[PDB]
Every structure is written in structure tokens, then in C-alpha cells.
Amino acid sequence: MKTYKVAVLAGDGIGPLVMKEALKILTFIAQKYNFSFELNEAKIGGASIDAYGVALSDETLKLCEQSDAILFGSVGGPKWDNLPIDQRPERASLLPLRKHFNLFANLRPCKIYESLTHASPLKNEIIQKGVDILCVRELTGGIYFGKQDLGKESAYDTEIYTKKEIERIARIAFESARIRKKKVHLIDKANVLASSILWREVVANVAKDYQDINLEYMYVDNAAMQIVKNPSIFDVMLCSNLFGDILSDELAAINGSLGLLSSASLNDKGFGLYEPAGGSAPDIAHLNIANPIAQILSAALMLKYSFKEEQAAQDIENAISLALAQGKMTKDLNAKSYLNTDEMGDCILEILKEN
Amino acid sequence: MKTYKVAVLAGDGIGPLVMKEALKILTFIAQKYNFSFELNEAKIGGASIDAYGVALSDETLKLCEQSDAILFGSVGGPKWDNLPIDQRPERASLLPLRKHFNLFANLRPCKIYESLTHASPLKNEIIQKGVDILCVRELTGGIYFGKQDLGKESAYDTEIYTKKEIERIARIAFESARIRKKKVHLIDKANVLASSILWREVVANVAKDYQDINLEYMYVDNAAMQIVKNPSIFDVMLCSNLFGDILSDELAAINGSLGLLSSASLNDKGFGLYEPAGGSAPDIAHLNIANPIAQILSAALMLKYSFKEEQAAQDIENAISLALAQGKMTKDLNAKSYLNTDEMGDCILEILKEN
User: Fold this and answer.
1) Where is chain A broken, named by the residue before each break, C–N > 2.5 Å?
2) Residue A24: how many CA atoms within 13 Å on its side-chain side?
3) Strand pairing partners for B219?
4) Spatial CB neighbours of B60, under 8 Å, sequence gap ≥ 6
5) Helix (H/G/I), strand (E/B), else coil: A108
6) Binding positions for NAD(+) (chains A, B)?
7) What are phi and psi of B288, to 5 degrees?
8) Annotated active-site residue in A245, A274, A305, A332
């Protein structure tokens, strides 16, 4: 009986709330496909600062190194916002976990359920053409980490990429498109940036190994228009760290349902950190209304990309698809009639049992 | 009788078509407020390549240096796309005119007429909160012009800004907000970029001279969400070259009516290049349906920012406001019933005479 070790870092605010549902779902589907989890809980972020004085402790970091994946909640809150900037929960948890496990690829899905057309800020006619996009963002390179300097009269940052960096994120994009609708858009600014011309060179060469995939190119400025005017053309969108950061946020916006958005941050060895894309939501941390679907979908991405448990993952995604299409939703999705956090989780679990 | 010298560079495709209307409007309002134009036509872009072998000639550059403003159409087209990249009409016309007259400030309005709510890709409810935004983009600095290198295995570009660069674009933003709704958002990425931290420093210090103005800060990624979810909060948005480039395009997209969008590119001495924000539109260059309003609005911006003819400008903007609200529109605005390019111009001119 194969056992998967998960480091569960629920974090702050709604984190521990939504996590409870994700673990309920994981424990069930584990048992249904006859594998087991060792779900190992540790403090991260605000909770860790209150306990150990640091957002990320050595004991938590060691647990992560001993695990196969990190299932991650949300970190941050007003209690901890008077700390110096570099010690705040968000900054001091995630950046070091990414560097330390070499999490260079960030995968952000944007698939708008037919049920939730109305929640998008785009007119329904644009959304009805069908929106199912995977943003693949290079996560540890580029301008955020290049040589920088802050002067009294002059300051600079450097957008630097190596071939190796570009290749490894490009492959994950091509691998993804191969089992989706066979299309990658590379988003860059190749009309003016040297780094972008390299991107094109290295990605055109990776594309030669993937004859099933149609590779297209689009400047970041045109992409920003396109995500609003006609997002149905995208399948997989491959972006640098900065352009992906900007455009995954725009995607989150046209999607409409923040509580549904998931995220995977992966290395090249099957290891990943999986989390809701939305933050800690302190406004509602004291209530029982947080949408747990993001976190649950994150757990499904975990199942796929780290444990190669594709049926388990697909069950969980189907069950959320069905629950929504039956009108069973949390407050952020339907203001007038809604389930509480634990009822939604229970609804999903109920749905999974019938199969 | 004061005379204003204009260099008219109509360019390619629909350029010379829409320009004809703008000159009809300019000649009239000139005469109504008892000043005169010397409207001096020269070739730029495709037309200039066909005539002189270069997109920008010395004779055209000299005309521009002898003028008070450049009224500019659109450049580019498929005929000229087999030229080496650096010689193509767009690249070889505008970048050198900007460098040469030090056009560091790009002003792009995004004001959605009540008439044209429907044309926006955002749901009407979001647009009805009222969208009236001026994007002020630094135009000659930043990563597009910093130190760069293209290697076999490694490539880089440098986002560099000086205090002087930041101050001069910040002032134009503050001056603009002072006669609008008293709000500037600085858009940056100050959580990770040194250049962005300078931006904040220099702009907070410029803001001290403008106690009427509320200065707010927002990261470029949040702005991209905000332009889709709730664009009504923006008044003046101040951006670096790259962030402004991306976000002016997103604004153009939520606006919905490309043929209405204008652009001013200014130095600190009252000199500017004024143009429709949209390109040369080769698909329709051979027809009589191009929307001339962008170009006409560009001429109004010219009147304001270069000639301090505010009443003249306001007449022209009012006349377009009224024409649209009376349903008088070109094809791109109303597919079923529409005016031709010259009727639209005539309609606008007709409207101006009544006042």
C-alpha cells in the first residue's frame, strides 16, 4: 500500500478553515483508490511567527524536505503588518520555499465553469466562446531576481534569463498543451527586449520536439487586450515571471470567482507546492463562509502533478463541476443563497461517494 | 492674427483618409476663434519609403523642427513588411521622432461615452460606474532603452530610471489630475523592483507640491485586475514605459471603440506629436468607412496641450460627444446603420456650426 507524504502548511486566516475540507476530500479519495496519505501539519506564516518568531522555521523546512509535496493554505494578516517588510508572512514563507525546492514553474488554471458565467466581469457573449486557459509562469528567474541597485538619483533592475531557465519552463508548457488543445502562446516583448529574443530562439527549438503543438507568439501588451476581448483563443500561455505575474492576475480577474482559483508551483522532479491563488482573506477569517473549492482544486493538482493519481484528481474536479452546476455554492459565488464552508466540503464529498 | 505651424504626417492606409477630416475640423475652428493654421503636409512611413527610400527623411525631420506640433496619422502596411525590422515604417518613423524632440510623456485618454457602453467587453454594470481615465506613460526611458545583451546562452535587459526622468513624467501627471478628479495612481512593482522604490521616493516628493491631489500606489499586477473589475476608481494613472504600454493597451481593450482612441506625446516645452492610438488598418484602407474620430480627438489634444486653445478643443470634444449621443456613428461603432468617413466628419462639422 503506497503512502504519500504531504506537508500541510495551512497558514493564517481562512487557511486552516479551507484546508480542513481539502484534507477531508483527500482522506476519502485516498481510501477509495487504496493508497494512503501521511498528512503532516506544520505552522507557516503568521502562525509560525507567533510560535517560533519566524515565518518559516527550520523544523518546518525539514518537514518539507522529508515530504513529496507541500499542500499550502494562505499566509498573512493585519496582526503581522508592522514587522519589517522582509519578515512579513507572505514574503518570508513562499519566496524561500520556492528557492529552496527550485520551484521554477507556476501553473495557474483559468477555466470558467458554465455555471459562473455571470460572475465574470466580461460580457457573457465573450465568455460563452469558452475559456479554458493554463498560464505557465517562470517563477524563480527574471527581473525580480536580477542584479539591481537603488541609488539617490538612479535605480535599476535587470531582466536576465539563461537558456536553461527558458527551456525548462517551455517544456512544462509544451507537455501541458500536448494533453490539452495543442496550442502554446509564448508571451514576450521581442520587438524591444533581448531577453525576449532569446525566449523565442529557445522556445522555437523546444517546439521542434513537439510536432503536435502549434506554437504562437504574442507581445505582452497584445495579450492584455486579448485576455479581455477574446480569451477563448488561449490554451496554454507561456510567460516570463513578470509577464506571467501580471497576466495571471488579469486572468484571475476575468474568471470572476477568486475562491475557485488554484495554483501549482513545481520543480523538475515531481515535487510541488499547491495552494489557492487567493490570499488569507482576513475580513472573513472569523466566519464559516470561506470558499474551500480553491484549496480543494489545489489538492487535485497535487494529486496529478506530484503523485500521478490522475483518476483521483479527475474525480475531485468532476465532483466540483457537478456541485456548482447543481447550484450548490458558497457566499462569494451566490450572495442570496449559500452553503457554509463545511457544508460545501460535505456536499462535494457526498457527490464523490455516489460514483 | 496668431498663426500655428503644424507638420501633418498622415502616413499610410487610412491615415490620409482620416486626416482629411481632422484638417476640415481644424480649418473651421481656426477661423471661428480668429487664428490661423499653416498645415504643412509631408510624407512619413510607407509613403516616405516609396518616395525617398527612408521612413523618415531629413526634409520631413526639418519640417517638424520648424513646426509647433506634429499631427500624425498611422504608419505601416503589408507592402513594407519584407524590409529588415529596423527599417519598417512604424519602427523607423516614431521612435526617432520621439527621441529627437524628447517626447517623454505619452497621454492616452480612456473615457467611455454613455452611448458606447455596449461596445465595451466589460459588463454594463461595471461601465455604468463611469470610466474616465488618463494614462500618463513615461515614453523614452526604462527597459526598452536600457543596457541590453543577446547572448547564445544568456540575455538581459535593464529597467533603469533617473530621478529626473521620474520627476518630469510625474509632474505632467500631477498637473493633469489637478484639473480632473484630483487623484493619481502610481503603478509600479515596488515590492521587488529597485527602480520602483525610486519611483515612489521621487513621486511622493513631487506630490508635496500638489496638496490638492490624492496620491495612491498600486502594483502593476493589481492594476491589471482593477482595470477589468472596477476601472471607475482611476482618474490619472502614472506608469513607467513598460507598465504604461501594457496597461494603456488593456484600457484600449475595455474601452471597446478603437476608432475613438487618441494619443498625445509631449516634451516639456509645449511641443507634441498627436495621433490616433490605433494602427494603419490595411483591411479597410481601400474603403470609405474608417472612423475619423480618433484623429479628430488627437487634433483637439493638439489644440489643448500645444496651442493652449482650450475652448477650441472643448468645442470639438463636445461636438463628438453630441454626434455619438445622437446615434451618428461609423461602421466600427454600429455595424447595422452607419456614416461613411467623410459624412461623419461633415456631421461633426455641422454640429460645430450651430454653436
Assistant:
1) none
2) 20
3) B188
4) B7, B9, B42, B43, B44, B48
5) strand
6) 77-90, 279-291
7) -115, 45
8) A245
What is the tally of structural domains in chain B? Answer: 1
On whether any CB of chain A is under 8 Å from the CB of B205, the answer is: no
User: How many distinct helices (H) and strands (E) make up chain B?
Assistant: 12, 12
Beta carbons of B155 and A155 less than 8 Å apart = no
Q: Find the residue in A nearest to B126 (Cα).
A: A121
Of B299, B302, B252, the C-alpha closest to B109 is B252
Cell triple for residue B100?
529627437
Q: What is the DSSP letter of A190?
A: T
In angstroms, what separates the C-alpha of A151 from chain B's closest C-alpha? Answer: 8
Around A196, how many Cα atoms within 13 Å sit in the side-chain half-sphere? 19
What was the structure determination method?
X-ray
Chain centre distance of CA A355? 27
For the packed helices B15-32 and B310-325, what is the interaxial angle rounded to 10 degrees? 120
Q: Which backbone phi and psi does B155 adopt, to 5 degrees?
A: -150, 150
How distant, in Å, are the alpha carbons of A6, A23, A64, A298, B328 from that of A27? 12, 6, 20, 15, 64
Q: Which residues contact B177 (CB under 8 A, 6 or more apart)?
A: B183, B184, B210, B213, B235, B236
**Domain boundaries, position A290:** 2-355
> Taking Cα atoms as reference points, which of B9, B92, B17 lies closest to residue B56?
B92
**CATH code: domain of residue A140:** 3.40.718.10
